[PDB]
Amino acid sequence: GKGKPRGLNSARKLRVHRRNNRWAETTYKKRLLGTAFKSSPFGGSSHAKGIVLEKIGIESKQPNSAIRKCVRVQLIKNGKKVTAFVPNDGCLNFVDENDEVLLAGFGRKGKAKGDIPGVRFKVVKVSGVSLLALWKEKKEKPRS
Amino acid sequence: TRTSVLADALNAINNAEKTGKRQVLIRPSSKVIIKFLQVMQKHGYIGEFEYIDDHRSGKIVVQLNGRLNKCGVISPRFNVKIADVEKWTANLLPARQFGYVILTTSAGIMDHEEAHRKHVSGKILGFVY
Amino acid sequence: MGRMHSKGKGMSSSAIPYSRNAPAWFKGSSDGVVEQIIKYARKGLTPSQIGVLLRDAHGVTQAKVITGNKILRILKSNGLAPEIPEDLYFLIKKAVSVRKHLERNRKDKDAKFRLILIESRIHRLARYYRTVSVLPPNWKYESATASALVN
Amino acid sequence: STELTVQSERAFQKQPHIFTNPKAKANRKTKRWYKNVGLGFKTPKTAIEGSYIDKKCPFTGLVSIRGKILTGTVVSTRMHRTIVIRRDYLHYVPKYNRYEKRHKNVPAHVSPAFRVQVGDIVTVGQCRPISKTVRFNVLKVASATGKANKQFAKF
RNA sequence: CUCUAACUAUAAAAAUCUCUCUUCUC
RNA sequence: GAAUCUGGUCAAACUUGGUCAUUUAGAGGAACUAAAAGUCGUAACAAGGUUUCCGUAGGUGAACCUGCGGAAGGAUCAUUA
RNA sequence: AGGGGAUCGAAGAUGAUCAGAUACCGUCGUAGUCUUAACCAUAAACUAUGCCGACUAGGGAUCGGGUGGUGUUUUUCUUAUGACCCACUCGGCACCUUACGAGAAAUCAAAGUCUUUGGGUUCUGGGGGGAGUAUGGUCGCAAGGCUGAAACUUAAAGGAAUUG
RNA sequence: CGGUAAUUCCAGCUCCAGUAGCGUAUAUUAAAGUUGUUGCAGUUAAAAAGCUCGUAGUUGAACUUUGGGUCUGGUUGUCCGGUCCGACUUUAUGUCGCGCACUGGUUUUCAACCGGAUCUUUCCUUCUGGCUAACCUGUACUCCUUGUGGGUGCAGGCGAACCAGGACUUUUACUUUGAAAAAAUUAGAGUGUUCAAAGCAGGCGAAAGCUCGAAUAUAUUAGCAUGGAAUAAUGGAAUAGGACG
RNA sequence: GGAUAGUGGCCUACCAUGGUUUCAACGGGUAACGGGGAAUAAGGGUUCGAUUCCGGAGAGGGAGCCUGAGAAACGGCUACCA
Ligand SMILES: [Mg+2]
Ligand SMILES: [Mg+2]
Ligand SMILES: [Mg+2]
Ligand SMILES: [Mg+2]
Ligand SMILES: [Mg+2]
Ligand SMILES: [Mg+2]
Ligand SMILES: [Mg+2]
Ligand SMILES: [Mg+2]
Ligand SMILES: [Mg+2]
Ligand SMILES: [Mg+2]
Ligand SMILES: [Mg+2]
Ligand SMILES: [Mg+2]
Ligand SMILES: [Mg+2]
Ligand SMILES: [Mg+2]
Ligand SMILES: [Mg+2]
Ligand SMILES: [Mg+2]
Ligand SMILES: [Mg+2]
Ligand SMILES: [Mg+2]
Ligand SMILES: [Mg+2]
Ligand SMILES: [Mg+2]
Ligand SMILES: [Mg+2]
Ligand SMILES: [Mg+2]
Ligand SMILES: [Mg+2]
Ligand SMILES: [Mg+2]
Ligand SMILES: [Mg+2]
Ligand SMILES: [Mg+2]
Ligand SMILES: [Mg+2]
Ligand SMILES: [Mg+2]
Ligand SMILES: [Mg+2]
Ligand SMILES: [Mg+2]
Ligand SMILES: [Mg+2]
Ligand SMILES: [Mg+2]
Ligand SMILES: [Mg+2]
Ligand SMILES: [Mg+2]
Ligand SMILES: [Mg+2]
Ligand SMILES: [Mg+2]
């Protein structure tokens, strides 16, 4: 049994077996192929700046019905365009179309989350300052 | 093609012991089997066995005294250092109190404690407990 | 019960008895047996045939037990061993028979299957008898050296 | 080797700064300086009475042996006056507790004082940089045949 | 501790569905 | 003994076209996801109302059907009645 | 490409049934069905169980073979056969009980001797889709095969098994 | 979760975990026996190339000196001799006790377990020379109680106690030990940085100079010497082209 | 033979046909300077090591250079491309 060779000089087949079968795992494939750098506009690094181009409201999945307020953003370090959702009650008025926004991932490792379609990112800072502080009024947008 | 003769020998031993057969028939009957069995008996884990001649490799008839729970081989005779043997202990012996991983060294086929007190290490063969 | 060229698992064989010495009842002596053996060999008889004849027509159970030595090695002693062992020779002959069949008619593709199997057996024996210094390594085998040697 | 009258190419072959005296009333053909490498190696007979030059011979040539000594198997003899030795050994990859039969082939220099066949087992030694491939040099061939010392069957 | 026998033959069409999904502790 | 300068010499570099990698627009072309109160039928899950499914080949608004070979994942493990 | 050309029968021509049936039903009827040379390389090429090994549990029966019967009918007054019954076995397809184990169970005498983890062994798969797809090869006269992704997208898909 | 009673929304209040730190995102490890060498699954869930031959790789049958007899160095625990310790309190012993708290003979039978010498038909390579280590030596035989209690001595002659000119030489892998692995980190010696992170300092005087240090292992792969000959591979002597005299 | 501090197809000249490979060559890729190490932790192990220590490498991209023991140096030069 155990159809993997066992002999005392019998692991070229074994080492190459692992060496080839690693590609089964997707994480290994992503890490070795640099897919977080060529593809996936968000360049694998935790944050990136961008410019707001337009605002959209999009519905939820089936077991919910709540039109979240997302924003089309163009990432300055590539010019590539993508959606990003803005989590809070009073945030859409804070978008200020044609502004600089600091964006991070939406915390699902390159996948949609919950009841949001086609979105992958969070809106964590707006115009230098952080939108979270604006939400609880800890600082104010200078309105430059 | 019988590849590791002692492997088959102990496999039959374990099969019958689980079944409860007070005795076992081993076909190949090589030196290594024999020495493994004097180690087996000297530790007290087996009774009196017999060798048959055939002018071809003989035969073995081992009397089971129930004290055995398992034999077992490590068919890849992994190369072991003097320090490493203890790890084999913690990976094959049911506890550190007793149990004997059998290894063949230049001195010969011996229990691991025999090797340690001889301070000599060779290659691994199997285990008994 | 290996049986490469099929799924056979039969252990039908012959088991030698315990006594490597000659049986008590036997009357003939080794030298006479050897002379009978060599005369039989000069008839042009393959060693296995001669062993069978010794077993049947006489109380010659084992060549080695009686004369202290086996048939092929004795036949080497008097410088009369054939160039090819009887085994490889008979296999080559059967291969020639297969070849003549396949040249006679074509649609025996299953006979092509037997052909490849047999020639694989020849390749195995060729490697063996090249390693053990029986044939000189120069010897090869395709179709026609068989036609010359066997015929 | 140099094959049947070494004095073949466009230049003469003379062991440097050894003088063949025409003024000696001797007719002694030539003065062939020779020397034993050492380390328990015996200079073979054919080297002392030979006529070849082989500036890169360890015995009759200019090179001096020093450093590593190895054992290997002749793998290729086609190349002229040199040789290639395969070396097969085991490599312990630690991840699997196993050894690994890999080969490394190395070129060395053979004097005409030696007869070499493919597959011969040869002791080789270290020397000066001789060629971009050759940095070792043969000493002597132990297994001259392997199994072929007896070939006939005439009892 | 003595038994081996009987047996039958329809087929006509039927297509579909947007709901709420809810909770278990001495 | 400088200038100039015979030769070669390493050769950066320039033109010229070939040749390749990568980005890169791109008339137009062909798909997939999520969106589930769009439309037509109802293919399937039971014998899904013609057993399914597979390979092959033609046709067929769509599903699919068809012919030939298969397999039970079938609805038969079963006729010395 | 060539010989055949009955029957059957994909295309098709057709008459039913139904709101729709160039579906199933029934007629005819090409390709094809037989095949000679040459391709074709796949099939649910599945026992969905790779091979070679040894060992473990009871039971009949069954095929090929051989062993021993004062075995029985055969009859060639007679043996010899054969053909049968008995007893044993070798090998082969399988089967019945069982759990002694082992499994997600359904079950399996191997799917066991596997955490008490190790007889030797080649090839495979790492959630579902996207997809056996794209792409580049490669084989091909072609139909097509072998090879073979990623982006993207989703929290289930799914296996056995439960009672309704 | 939310569709008019929200244990989740959003605030307020009660609180829970965290704490000068804590929360987010992107990568990573363990969890992961979800990469399975240790240690995966393959009748149905993912998956055994249709089957077969077959190069390379991988795997490979069993078989060739094992037992005693003796002697010893030991390292352990076995009686303890002495040294002496707790019951007895300011001080001490006979006595009871842990039946030696610190040291030996080991024939106390005991058991080992490591070698070492050895008799095995038992090689552990042996010569060519030192050097002779040494005493079968053997010369004066004697310092001496007949008595081997004890030795200078000088040609044969023990070499194995160590040296040295070769000649021999089956080789492996393996393994033990030693040599190398700078440092730094790791491990950990000691050391009151106020503790600790640390760091490699410090401690004692009487302050009159007197001292401790800066401990120790690890690294396995390549290489070198090394004790071992079980495991596994390899060579023989077949045309004797063989071994010795 | 030249040349080099000195070997060597280092370069030349005359020849010879060779060398490496499925035990992974060569090509492609490397968001790779290699290591000492770091993280992680039953054991086996996985990932990171631009970065205090070691080496090696560069001074915009290539080249060429005198001086000097030691330079192909760049806070030294000669030239082209930017
Ligand atoms: Mg319906
Ligand atoms: Mg010039
Ligand atoms: Mg409609
Ligand atoms: Mg329907
Ligand atoms: Mg119907
Ligand atoms: Mg259907
Ligand atoms: Mg036709
Ligand atoms: Mg018809
Ligand atoms: Mg109609
Ligand atoms: Mg219908
Ligand atoms: Mg029709
Ligand atoms: Mg019809
Ligand atoms: Mg298929
Ligand atoms: Mg069959
Ligand atoms: Mg997938
Ligand atoms: Mg799928
Ligand atoms: Mg293709
Ligand atoms: Mg409320
Ligand atoms: Mg809230
Ligand atoms: Mg798993
Ligand atoms: Mg499935
Ligand atoms: Mg399959
Ligand atoms: Mg198959
Ligand atoms: Mg092979
Ligand atoms: Mg063996
Ligand atoms: Mg270090
Ligand atoms: Mg520390
Ligand atoms: Mg490259
Ligand atoms: Mg790196
Ligand atoms: Mg670095
Ligand atoms: Mg550096
Ligand atoms: Mg200077
Ligand atoms: Mg420079
Ligand atoms: Mg510099
Ligand atoms: Mg500078
Ligand atoms: Mg300057």
Side-chain angles (χ1 to χ4, degrees):
Chain A
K2 292 192 187 297
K4 52 168 181 188
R6 270 179 179 181
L8 273 300
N9 63 15
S10 305
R12 264 92 150 181
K13 296 297 304 189
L14 187 153
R15 187 213 176 122
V16 176
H17 209 293
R18 197 59 67 194
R19 185 72 177 87
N20 190 1
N21 204 47
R22 281 305 266 268
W23 267 262
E25 308 175 4
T26 48
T27 49
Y28 181 97
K29 193 163 189 169
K30 279 190 165 172
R31 194 166 53 95
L32 277 296
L33 294 175
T35 79
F37 277 153
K38 305 299 291 314
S39 68
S40 58
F42 194 10
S45 176
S46 181
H47 285 74
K49 283 157 170 66
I51 294 314
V52 167
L53 290 174
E54 271 166 329
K55 311 166 85 165
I56 298 89
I58 311 97
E59 42 265 50
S60 305
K61 194 63 67 68
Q62 275 315 92
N64 296 136
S65 84
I67 52 171
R68 322 305 152 79
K69 291 79 189 175
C70 309
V71 164
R72 278 274 195 178
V73 292
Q74 203 186 296
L75 275 297
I76 193 66
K77 64 92 175 180
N78 290 138
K80 295 193 81 213
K81 302 172 178 202
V82 73
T83 176
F85 156 71
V86 194
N88 260 322
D89 190 30
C91 65
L92 178 145
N93 47 5
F94 285 6
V95 175
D96 291 331
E97 161 60 34
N98 296 115
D99 186 74
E100 314 172 276
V101 57
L102 283 72
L103 297 173
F106 194 71
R108 264 274 280 152
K109 318 315 197 176
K111 275 145 62 196
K113 155 171 140 186
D115 51 5
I116 301 169
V119 185
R120 293 205 209 240
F121 292 162
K122 278 181 67 179
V123 176
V124 72
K125 290 157 103 169
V126 285
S127 70
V129 290
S130 311
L131 186 57
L132 183 62
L134 277 296
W135 182 50
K136 306 167 300 317
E137 190 276 331
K138 266 179 162 172
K139 291 177 70 68
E140 303 70 41
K141 189 178 170 293
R143 317 176 60 70
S144 52
Chain B
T1 63
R2 292 188 189 85
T3 48
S4 187
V5 298
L6 187 153
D8 210 32
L10 60 83
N11 164 286
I13 295 165
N14 274 6
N15 190 318
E17 190 277 331
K18 261 188 212 153
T19 311
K21 300 289 94 175
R22 280 184 56 85
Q23 63 84 30
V24 285
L25 277 296
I26 293 157
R27 277 286 313 279
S29 165
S30 178
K31 291 174 71 175
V32 191
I33 297 169
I34 297 169
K35 311 298 266 161
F36 204 100
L37 268 295
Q38 292 83 18
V39 176
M40 187 66 204
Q41 212 194 50
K42 182 63 69 177
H43 268 301
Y45 263 86
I46 207 60
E48 304 280 20
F49 64 93
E50 295 294 329
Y51 166 88
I52 293 304
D53 187 80
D54 186 74
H55 293 283
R56 313 173 193 169
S57 306
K59 209 76 60 186
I60 301 299
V61 176
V62 176
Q63 273 313 339
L64 182 63
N65 193 359
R67 285 178 172 88
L68 187 153
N69 49 60
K70 294 155 59 185
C71 278
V73 66
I74 288 294
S75 64
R77 280 76 180 272
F78 283 164
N79 189 358
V80 76
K81 299 289 94 176
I82 182 181
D84 293 328
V85 65
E86 297 173 352
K87 314 302 201 203
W88 285 96
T89 300
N91 298 129
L92 277 296
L93 300 187
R96 216 155 54 252
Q97 288 55 20
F98 70 99
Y100 303 125
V101 64
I102 298 89
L103 61 83
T104 175
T105 189
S106 293
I109 296 93
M110 307 141 76
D111 66 83
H112 62 87
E113 292 213 316
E114 189 77 22
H116 205 56
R117 67 193 273 140
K118 274 199 191 71
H119 186 271
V120 176
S121 179
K123 272 154 73 146
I124 187 168
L125 282 177
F127 64 90
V128 65
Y129 63 91
Chain C
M1 66 277 298
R3 322 290 313 259
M4 284 74 74
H5 286 37
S6 313
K7 277 145 201 179
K9 305 279 177 198
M11 61 155 188
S12 65
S13 66
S14 306
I16 193 66
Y18 183 81
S19 172
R20 292 273 162 72
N21 55 316
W25 62 270
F26 196 71
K27 181 253 288 183
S29 294
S30 59
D31 183 10
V33 184
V34 176
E35 84 184 357
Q36 298 158 262
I37 287 161
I38 62 170
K39 297 304 289 293
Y40 291 178
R42 284 182 182 172
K43 298 162 68 173
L45 267 70
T46 61
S48 296
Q49 284 168 226
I50 284 163
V52 176
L53 298 196
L54 290 174
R55 208 194 43 231
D56 291 331
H58 294 88
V60 185
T61 77
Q62 295 90 57
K64 154 192 171 203
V65 162
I66 285 295
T67 75
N69 188 351
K70 302 178 187 293
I71 292 193
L72 273 298
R73 164 162 147 65
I74 293 296
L75 183 63
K76 192 190 298 292
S77 63
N78 64 2
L80 294 174
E83 78 287 15
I84 298 184
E86 42 190 6
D87 193 325
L88 204 41
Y89 181 76
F90 292 165
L91 277 296
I92 301 313
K93 189 193 83 186
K94 198 189 265 154
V96 176
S97 189
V98 172
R99 182 139 286 291
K100 70 182 286 185
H101 191 95
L102 276 74
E103 62 204 79
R104 186 248 295 169
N105 51 5
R106 173 177 168 80
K107 276 209 176 310
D108 293 331
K109 286 160 196 200
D110 61 340
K112 174 158 68 172
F113 182 85
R114 280 83 65 191
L115 189 146
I116 193 66
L117 294 174
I118 298 314
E119 284 203 308
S120 159
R121 320 193 82 187
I122 296 89
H123 206 189
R124 288 167 167 245
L125 277 296
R127 174 202 311 180
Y128 170 74
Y129 278 94
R130 280 189 214 90
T131 61
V132 298
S133 80
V134 172
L135 287 175
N138 57 359
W139 185 89
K140 280 73 176 175
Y141 182 76
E142 69 276 16
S143 67
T145 177
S147 80
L149 287 160
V150 168
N151 295 9
Chain D
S1 53
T2 315
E3 211 281 337
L4 272 73
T5 69
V6 175
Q7 305 315 114
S8 55
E9 73 202 359
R10 284 173 58 84
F12 192 84
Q13 293 73 37
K14 180 265 292 180
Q15 47 172 19
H17 63 86
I18 295 90
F19 167 46
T20 72
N21 186 219
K23 201 69 205 191
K25 281 175 56 179
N27 285 304
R28 301 178 213 251
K29 277 74 69 178
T30 187
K31 272 71 67 178
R32 191 186 204 70
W33 164 93
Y34 78 117
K35 175 263 294 180
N36 71 75
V37 290
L39 277 296
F41 269 117
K42 295 184 287 292
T43 182
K45 166 57 215 73
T46 72
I48 306 86
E49 293 179 353
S51 72
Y52 65 92
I53 178 65
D54 199 316
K55 76 155 75 172
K56 302 170 201 148
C57 174
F59 292 121
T60 62
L62 294 174
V63 65
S64 64
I65 181 169
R66 76 286 184 275
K68 297 292 292 296
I69 62 170
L70 281 74
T71 62
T73 62
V74 175
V75 65
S76 189
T77 76
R78 314 141 176 73
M79 72 292 292
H80 181 78
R81 277 176 55 85
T82 49
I83 193 78
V84 176
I85 297 89
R86 188 179 292 268
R87 187 143 191 255
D88 306 341
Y89 73 97
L90 277 296
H91 181 255
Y92 180 83
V93 160
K95 186 178 185 293
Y96 305 139
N97 304 119
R98 188 194 68 90
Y99 293 98
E100 184 276 335
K101 293 187 286 184
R102 84 181 61 101
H103 77 265
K104 298 291 180 68
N105 53 3
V106 57
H109 181 74
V110 286
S111 173
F114 298 94
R115 196 69 274 160
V116 180
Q117 294 82 17
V118 55
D120 291 331
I121 296 89
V122 175
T123 74
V124 193
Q126 198 172 9
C127 69
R128 276 172 53 251
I130 301 299
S131 74
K132 289 302 188 295
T133 61
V134 176
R135 278 149 292 300
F136 295 176
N137 164 17
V138 298
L139 277 296
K140 64 152 291 303
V141 193
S143 179
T145 59
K147 297 175 176 68
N149 273 117
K150 268 78 177 179
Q151 200 65 55
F152 277 104
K154 61 185 289 184
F155 265 115

